[PDB]
């Protein structure tokens, strides 16, 4: 308990905002609330009020809240709280962190609580580059605290604090049958099959976790498997405005292993999709800004029966592909299968204040 609390203050520091976390987990049933505090000394411009707002928007044209550049923006969730003078005391339920963060701080510490409803798109940004006919687009969760009389008043950069948290998505490992796929090929002039079977240890991976592909190849043919190629692909379907389907390998193992004619083979391959490598070039769905060590490869969007597909903005999903490349000595054919999995965000923690400030900024 050297408790980390992330602080950001006004450019001219009358307003300062504190949060317990920058990332807020979605456990499919309900999101971690945004419990925070606003520390303002009632002397500056609109000596009536300070407000805090949560905005969830899909944006296209840049990736921030900007005027020059924003070509499309679909609003997905907005919440406005009046944090000075305390509005009617029906949403008094405080949290254990908030109480520390008004006791440790002055009488000028006023809390806010945001509840994100389930089924929103998690944070996502996608960077089209060379290959594309498009520019930055993504989903942001923007917390903005600003002083005003009015709240129809034009907000002051002088008066504002603005900090982009992430809503990251978690799924629990559900056991059962693991992913499997298989195919059988018969090539010209023979009825001897080449059979490929693959399997992943799990369904629900978490960032950084390795994935173990179990491979079985029954080659009854007269042909040799020249190489084995295991790969991970991200597919990101833009569903809003300028639709597009992108596809990007994010892991690749092309081993020199061979299946000789009328033989069989099995080997468990392990590779991990990273993005750390060359920081993704173009077209890759990240869950954050490329510039931050903080951010991952996006998590898979979780779909439901009856779900409205388009208001999710980008549909993100991953598959493993296992390719056998076939030939015989001295126009060569390939036998492959594909297996989906769910890439998710790891949960951080299941392991008189001493509350100590971090400068809210991603590194």
């Amino acid at each position: 308990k050297g408790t980390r609390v992330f602080k950001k203050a006004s450019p001219n520091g009358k307003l300062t905002v504190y949060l317990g976390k920058r990332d807020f987990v979605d456990h499919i049933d309900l999101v971690d609330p945004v419990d925070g505090v606003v520390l303002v000394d009632p002397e500056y411009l609109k000596e009536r009020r300070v407000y805090v707002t949560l905005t969830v928007a899909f944006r296209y044209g840049r990736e921030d809240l900007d005027v020059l550049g924003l070509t499309f923006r679909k609003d997905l969730f907005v919440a406005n709280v009046q944090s000075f003078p305390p509005a009617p005391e029906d949403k008094k339920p405080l949290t254990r962190l908030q109480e520390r963060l008004i006791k440790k701080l002055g009488e000028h510490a006023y809390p806010f609580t945001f509840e994100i409803p389930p089924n929103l798109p998690s944070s996502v940004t996608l960077q089209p580059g060379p290959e594309d006919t498009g520019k930055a687009l993504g989903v942001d969760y923007e917390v903005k605290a600003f002083v005003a009389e009015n709240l129809e008043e034009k907000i002051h950069k002088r008066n504002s604090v603005r900090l982009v948290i992430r809503k990251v998505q978690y799924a629990p490992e559900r056991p059962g049958p693991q992913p499997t796929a298989e195919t059988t090929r018969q090539f010209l002039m023979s009825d001897k099959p080449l059979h490929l079977e693959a399997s992943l240890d799990k369904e629900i991976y978490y960032h950084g976790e390795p994935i173990s592909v179990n491979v079985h190849v029954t080659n009854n043919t007269n042909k040799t498997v020249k190489k084995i190629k295991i790969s991970v692909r991200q597919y990101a379907d833009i569903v809003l405005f300028n639709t597009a389907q992108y596809k990007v390998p994010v892991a690749m193992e092309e081993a020199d292993d061979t299946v000789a004619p009328s033989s069989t083979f099995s080997k468990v391959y392990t590779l991990t999709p990273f993005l750390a490598n060359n920081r993704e070039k173009r077209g890759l769905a990240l869950d954050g800004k490329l510039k931050h060590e903080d951010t991952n490869l996006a998590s898979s969007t979780l779909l439901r029966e009856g779900a409205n597909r388009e208001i999710l903005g980008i549909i993100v999903s991953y598959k493993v592909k296992v390719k056998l490349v076939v030939s015989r000595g001295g126009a060569s054919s390939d036998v492959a299968v594909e297996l989906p999995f769910t890439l998710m965000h790891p949960k951080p923690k299941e392991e008189d204040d001493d509350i100590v400030f971090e400068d809210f900024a991603r590194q």
Partner: peptide, 10 residues
């Protein structure tokens, strides 16, 4: 309609 309308690197 509940009201409507960062990332430093140098």
């Amino acid at each position: 309609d509940d009201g409507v309308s960062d990332c430093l690197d140098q």
